[PDB]
Amino acid sequence: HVDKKVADKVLLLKQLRIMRLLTRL
């Protein structure tokens, strides 16, 4: 069921912290 970008979700979910720290919102 590989629609598209079938990974980013994982990155944002896992990186979540790293993401908010890196970015802001």
Curated annotation (Swiss-Prot):
GO biological process, one term: defense response to bacterium
Superkingdom, natural source: Eukaryota
Keyword check for Cytoplasm: no
Keyword Secreted: yes
Alphabetical UniProt keywords: Antibiotic, Antimicrobial, Fungicide, Secreted
Reported induction: By bacterial infection.
Extent of the signal sequence: none
Subcellular localization, as worded in the UniProt entry: Secreted
Biological role stated in the UniProt entry: Active against Gram-positive bacteria B.megaterium and M.luteus, Gram-negative bacteria E.coli SBS363 and D22, K.pneumoniae, S.typhimurium and P.aeruginosa, yeast C.albicans and filamentous fungi F.culmorum, N.crassa, N.hematococca and T.viridae. Inactive against Gram-positive bacteria B.subtilis, S.pyogenes, B.thuringiensis and S.aureus, Gram-negative bacteria E.cloacae and E.carotovora and filamentous fungus B.bassiana.
Protein name: Spinigerin
Organism listed in the record: Pseudacanthotermes spiniger
